[PDB]
Design a protein around this ligand. Structure first.
Ligand SMILES: Nc1ncnc2c1nc(Br)n2[C@@H]1O[C@H](COP(=O)(O)O)[C@@H](O)[C@H]1O
Ligand SMILES: Nc1ncnc2c1nc(Br)n2[C@@H]1O[C@H](COP(=O)(O)O)[C@@H](O)[C@H]1O
Lengths: 115, 115
């Protein structure tokens, strides 16, 4: 089973449905099931990296790719006014799914602190 | 003037002081002046990219590098329990400084939504 064995791995293999917004050979983007902003989606790599602390130096381009796709999708969805990108790491970060993912939230004004 | 003409460009050129945690040929990391968590630092590229929406495809590795450094520094600072990485884009994102930067916050439990 490619893409790892998490909720996100099942989405990658198309075992469970998702609202796919973009997909390329390296990653996939889909809407969040519990949105915290009018537009709230996730960008995940097809390669299974459990968390950012486990990313290797060679994973550098793939991690930057998730942000370039997040930026392009946010443009497609009409987020002219901006957005906020978030990566949660571990317990204190609020990570509940152990497959690296990037949150892209917009459509409203984001506050500070970021949680 | 290299590193652009923002508060962050002055930090890069060493015109104004900062608590530097890490520096390499591509980026620099320093503590935030108004921390929102026990440990709160920024990772910025030396190359001037005003905002994530203005990042080009070739900037992919540099953007991923900021996260790899954020991950390594967070390890140095003892963030065993996790952290949250944030990039603010534009007005809705809460961007006040127009030089791409990554926030790394930890030391306490981060909440949801992220602002
Ligand atoms: N099947 C699914 N489709 C869309 N997003 C999902 C999902 N299952 C989960 Br869990 N989510 C989202 O995955 C996110 C988990 O992110 P953290 O691990 O950073 O909390 C949550 O925002 C949650 O709503
Ligand atoms: N001289 C400085 N040294 C440390 N951080 C700084 C700074 N000047 C500024 Br502005 N900051 C920080 O830069 C951040 C700006 O991030 P946003 O643009 O995403 O709000 C704030 O968290 C602020 O505290």
């Amino acid at each position: 089973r490619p893409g790892g064995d998490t909720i996100f791995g099942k989405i990658i293999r198309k075992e469970i449905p998702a609202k796919i917004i973009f997909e390329d050979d390296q990653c996939l983007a889909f809407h969040d099931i519990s949105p915290q902003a009018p537009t709230h989606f996730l960008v995940i790599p097809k390669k299974h990296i459990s968390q950012i602390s486990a990313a290797e130096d060679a994973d550098e381009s793939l991690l930057g790719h998730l942000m370039i796709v997040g930026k392009k999708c946010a443009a497609d969805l009409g987020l002219k006014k901006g957005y906020r990108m978030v990566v949660n790491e571990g317990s204190d970060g609020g990570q509940s799914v152990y497959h690296v993912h990037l949150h892209v939230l917009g459509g409203r004004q984001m506050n500070w602190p970021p949680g």
